[PDB]
Every structure is written in structure tokens, then in C-alpha cells.
């Protein structure tokens, strides 16, 4: 079947509740009294204009079989997040969002499959809602690529990833929270540079650092987007790896090697991207995600493998297969 | 015949010359008595230890030697930029170091040739800054992207490529200058993340604003380091273009369809992602440009090139002929 993971959800959830977490920062869901558009809040504020697919699960079924994917697996919006909260208000966010995530799915458990946010902030409370959401339902968790000036080296982010690994816990890393701050306002440039670089600086802050080492090989790790511009800028990084000290300093093997180590998913809405990145990661490593339903996630879920010259079982791996043992959907 | 197009060179120059400038800012060039070491200054204290090559044209002419390479364009280290300085003392910096980079170029105008730095702070002293020195022998003008501290380019910076394309002087964008604030604090990651980044914003910055159209196409402007990023995301870019209108707003065709109106040196380090580069940009718009002298300089110069599964007729553009048309070398 088609296994598309990488989508969004949105729950039900209205500006006084979200009041009673954080009058001012904590987003909650305006829907239209037809109940077909809406706005995503965030106090008082305008923060993006959404669809019915975003939090309907029966609608999200119609488009589901439209573009023919089978199975779903979806997650958090990032704006969900809350890294920035005090901690127990974050986490007791978290465990109301993953909460609204089961009942989501639960609509039809069988194609809608869901991960679970964490209290980042918060190592203890992190990997509490990590498992507890896991056994109660979630197939793993999806977390920011970053908190504050913390990248993925940050020993309270590689803990957390050491104790997914532990419970056998797959992640889904997204980039947020862009980098570039007050240059790259118009024309969405946030989406078209700061969050490729965002993933590729994820990426490299664990490989740099070393931190692969220390993690258990057993740990399932994918990047959003592609990985970024990672693929493509590898060549760069194993250069400055061979020619320079303070880049080699932690990191005992050529940067190249570790793409064993994670996956990538597939959408970086170019022919010979996608083969340059297959190239890099080989087929075992890609998988499909569309980045649904918003605006510029790939239109034709899937589209752009099929089309692609790729060998028939290179195209059924990263449809299916690849995201069958990621996240143990059978 | 073999042309590097990308190097630099920094002046020879004293603490008590630059004093005349600035105590503090205004840079410096120490060598020891065994006259191979060398390092530049800024205060009292070390900026950066140097290479003999990158002063000393003696010394350069040899390795260009023992590499294939017959003529260098070379320019100013960003560090001798001064884009934040006042833009009159940076008006008067500026025109010494392209009179410091034409006795430089005097020792071999067959094989060293220069590219001029500008005040760019101040529109007109800038313009006037070029002018006067492309007529002293300068084949163009290096820019960063920025101005010490700044916000990208607005229309000030349009009408500067405008001075330069009908005056029929060309450009090297060189990335400069962070990106990523009190991240990406090791393992050289400003340069491996940050630097291709702010090159492939410069580049989309042009495309997406519309500027493009307000340039003459008589404009001759390459980008630094293969244009970053930017090819492997232009997909990305393209399927943002034709969902979301405010990506649409000021760009009248596809960005992609742009890929004529600029040139990428060729330093990605890398068959594959040369070859990606080379099919988007076309092999009449990538030039050789190795980097020289610095650590992270391709070391063979022209080997990643000559290596490829390209084609000869290829290779020959990029090796030589591009960058014979472009600074208008015979
Ligand atoms: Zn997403
Ligand atoms: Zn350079």
C-alpha cells in the first residue's frame, strides 16, 4: 500500500481552554460555522489559515482515498510545541494534545496512524510522555530540530534520543523555529532556506559531535524535508572533516558514513533530488512523506517517486516498505 | 587552458600602515623572519594564521605551477571587507587595497588577475569606488552579501548591480558573515550550514524580489561556492511559487526559469552534486573556482571537474571558457 508519513493534524481545541494553559502563546483552533475553513490562533492573534483536513478525521479519509494513500501517519503541527513554556504546563499540554491525537486516530485506528509531542524542555518530563503516550497508542514521537540555542549535541537532546533508542521509540525529527531572524520575511523564504538549513545543521550536529557513537544503533531517526540540503552539501562536509582539526576533534569516522545511522523522507519536489538524495541515503533510507494538507506539501501524494526512474523495488520500499519497519505498521 | 576563478590574496601591509586606519579594526599582515609562516592581525592579537601563499605573488606562481592552473583571479579575504566601517574611511581603505591588489596582480598580469572591493555601505562612493578601478586593470568587483551587520539587499543594492551591469562590470557574490547567532559554535558548522545558506538567500533573494527584471540581462554576476544550496532546493522553491501567491507576488515566471541570469563557480566537492549543479545551472554557467589558498581550497584545483562523468565539451566550458567570456580573458 501507500504509506504516507509525514502529515499534520490540528485538534479541537478553543480559545479559553487554550486561555487556561496560556492566554497569549498557547494556539487553538477558530473554525468557520460551516465548519469547512479555519484559523489556527495564538492568543487573540491570526497565525495561519487551515482547512477541514487538519483536524476532521472522516474528511481526512476522503482525500485519503483521492490521492490513494493507505495509511497515514500523522503528528503534531509545530506551532503545538510549547518548548519555550514553563515545564509542567508544557508537559500537561503535551499529554492533552496526545490525548486529542489517539481520539483522532481512534475514528479509524487502521489507516490513521499518530506521534506524540514531548516536553523537550524538560529531559524527565520527556521521556515520561515519550512512554506513556507509546504504550497507549502513539508509534513514536515527533520532536523540533532545535530548542532555543540548543542543536541536537546538546546532551539533554542526545539523552532523550538514547532513551527512545533504549524503548525502541522511533523519531521524527522537524525543523522549527527558524534560524535567520529578522532577514528573511518575504516571499516565505523561512520555508526555503532557514528550514533546509535548520534539518541540515540537525543532521550535522549529531554526526559532528559524535553523538552517533554514544547512541544505540538500534535507534529509528528520520529528518523531515529531505534532510534538508544535507545530501547535497555532504561533499563539503567530508572536505572540511579531511582537512581540518576542529572538525574532525569528535567526530572518529568521514561525516559520510553515518547516513546508516537515519532516514530521510522523500519530499524535496525535484526528479534529480530525489536521486541525489536515494544516491546518498540508498533506498532503504527514503520515505514517503508529503507534508499534508498544507499549501506546499506535494500535491499528488507520492507523485513524484512513481514518476521517477527509479527501480520497481526502490519505488515500493519508500512507499511502503521502509515505513513498515520504521514504525512497525504491519 | 586552465582558469581558477575564485581565490584570495591579503596585502602587505603593517600595524602602524593600517594603525593610520583604525587600532582595533582595520587589519594587518605579521610574518616571521623565516619568512613561509605569517598571520593576520587585527589589534595586538591574532585574527587568523596565513599561509604564504595567500601574500607573496612569488611564491603563488610557483603552485600554480605544480597545479593545472595558468591564470588565478583572486580578491579581497571578506575580512578586509569593512562593510560596517564609516563610508568614507571605507572609501579611502577600499581604494588601497585595489591599488595593495594591483601591484599584487603586477608581478604577472598574464596569470594573476583582480577583482576589486567596494565600500558598500554608501551607494555612490561604492559605484565610484568601481568604476575607478576596473579603468586600473581590476577584471571586477567581489561584494559580500551584507554590510558589516545588515539585512540582505533592497533597492540600493539593485541599483548597484544596475551601476555595474551597464558599466559592464562583473561581480563575485562572496558569502559572508554568520547567520546562526550563538548557535553553530563548532566544528566549522558557519561554514559547512550558515555560508551556503546566506548564498543561496542571496541568490533567491534576486530571483524572488522581481529584481531580475529590473537588471539588464547585460548584468555579469557569479556566486560564490556553487551557489550554496541552491540548486538542490530549487525544487522546493518552484512548488512554493505555484501554491502560495505571495511567493508568485513579484516574481512573474517560475524561479527556476532564472537560471540564465546568473553563474556558480563550481567548488561543491562532490561528482554527484557537480553533476545535479551542472544540469540546472547548464555547463555554460559554471565556472572552476577552487578557493585558494585557504584549508578548505578543493587541493587538487580542477580535479572534481576533470574526474566527471561529464561530458569533454563540458569540461572544457567550465575549466576555460566561461570564466574567459565572463572576466573577458583571452
Ligand atoms: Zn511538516
Ligand atoms: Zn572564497
Redesign the interface.
Known amino acids: 500500500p501507500r504509506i504516507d508519513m509525514h502529515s499534520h493534524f490540528f485538534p479541537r481545541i478553543s480559545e479559553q481552554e487554550a486561555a487556561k494553559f496560556d492566554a497569549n502563546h498557547a494556539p487553538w483552533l477558530q473554525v468557520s460555522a460551516k465548519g469547512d475553513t479555519g484559523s489556527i490562533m495564538m492568543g487573540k492573534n491570526n497565525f495561519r489559515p487551515v482547512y477541514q483536513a487538519l483536524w476532521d478525521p472522516a474528511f481526512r479519509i476522503e482525500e485519503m482515498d483521492a490521492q490513494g494513500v493507505d495509511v497515514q501517519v500523522t503528528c503534531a503541527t509545530p506551532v503545538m510545541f510549547g518548548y519555550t513554556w514553563e515545564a509542567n504546563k508544557a508537559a500537561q499540554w503535551a499529554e492533552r494534545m496526545n490525548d486529542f491525537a489517539l481520539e483522532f486516530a481512534a475514528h479509524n485506528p487502521q489507516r490513521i496512524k499518530v506521534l506524540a509531542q514531548v516536553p523537550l524542555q524538560d529531559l524527565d518530563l520527556a521521556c515520561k510522555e515519550a512512554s506513556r503516550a507509546v504504550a497507549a497508542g502513539h508509534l513514536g514521537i515527533q520532536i523540533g530540530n532545535?530548542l532555543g540555542?540548543k542543536?541536537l549535541?546538546d546532551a539533554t537532546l542526545e539523552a532523550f534520543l538514547t532513551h527512545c533508542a533504549n524503548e525502541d521509540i522511533p523519531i521524527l525529527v522537524h525543523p522549527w523555529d527558524m534560524?535567520?531572524?529578522?532577514?528573511?520575511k518575504?516571499?516565505?523564504?523561512p520555508?526555503?532556506?532557514?528550514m533546509?538549513?535548520e534539518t541540515?545543521?540537525a543532521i550535522?550536529?549529531l554526526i559532528?559531535?559524535g553523538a552517533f557513537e554514544r547512541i544505540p544503533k538500534s535507534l529509528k531517526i528520520c529528518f523531515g524535508?529531505g534532510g534538508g540540503?544535507f545530501?547535497?552539501?555532504?561533499?563539503?562536509?567530508?572536505?572540511?572533516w579531511r582537512?581540518?582539526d576542529?572538525?574532525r576533534?569528535?567526530?572518529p569516522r568521514p561525516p559520510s558514513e553515518y547516513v546508516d545511522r537515519f532516514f530521510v523522507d522523500s519530499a524535496?519536489?525535484?526528479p534529480?533530488?530525489l536521486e541525489?538524495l536515494v544516491?546518498?541515503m540508498g533506498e532503504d533510507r527514503v520515505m514517503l512523506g508529503s507534508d499534508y494538507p498544507f499549501?506546499?506539501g506535494?500535491?499528488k501524494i507520492g507523485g513524484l517517486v512513481l514518476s521517477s526512474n527509479l527501480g520497481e523495488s526502490a519505488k515500493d520500499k519508500i512507499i511502503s516498505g521502509n515505513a513498515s519497519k520504521f514504525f512497525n505498521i504491519n
Open positions: 532545535h540555542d542543536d549535541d534560524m535567520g531572524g529578522q532577514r528573511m518575504k516571499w516565505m523564504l520555508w526555503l532556506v532557514a533546509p538549513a541540515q545543521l550535522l550536529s559532528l559531535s524535508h540540503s545530501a547535497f552539501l555532504l561533499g563539503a562536509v567530508d572536505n572540511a582537512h581540518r576542529i572538525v576533534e569528535d567526530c524535496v519536489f525535484n534529480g533530488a541525489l544516491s546518498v499549501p506546499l506535494e500535491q
